[PDB]
Design a protein around this ligand. Sequence first.
Ligand SMILES: CN[C@@H](C)C(=O)N[C@H](C(=O)N1CC[C@H]2CC[C@H](NC(=O)C(c3ccccc3)c3ccccc3)[C@H]21)C(C)(C)C
Ligand SMILES: [Zn+2]
Length: 90
Amino acid sequence: GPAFPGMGSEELRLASFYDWPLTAEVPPELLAAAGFFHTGHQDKVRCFFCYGGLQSWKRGDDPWTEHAKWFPGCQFLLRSKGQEYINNIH
Ligand SMILES: CN[C@@H](C)C(=O)N[C@H](C(=O)N1CC[C@H]2CC[C@H](NC(=O)C(c3ccccc3)c3ccccc3)[C@H]21)C(C)(C)C
Ligand SMILES: [Zn+2]
């Protein structure tokens, strides 16, 4: 199961980005869709399922790409995007 079942809802994850500092650079909509919620500190986010944390986001970063790059074993990622997607990023 998920590390943090309470953030399994995409809408709850999106709400967590109310004070996100990088709206134009890395959209909250895409971060939330990709399993991430905002910790509230700087640009630190975490996936609700694998609990993997990512920070130091660069403008134009693709949240799903970064998810697969750093946490390829995440089952939410696999369920959502499929194995071919994960394999191609590697
Ligand atoms: C350029 N795109 C971004 C999304 C990126 O690749 N970020 C990397 C990243 O954040 N990573 C890579 C994979 C993870 C391991 C190293 C880094 N982890 C953290 O920064 C976490 C952390 C560890 C120790 C002290 C403070 C923070 C972290 C924890 C919770 C939330 C966010 C990050 C995570 C970085 C900083 C190494 C370029
Ligand atoms: Zn994950």
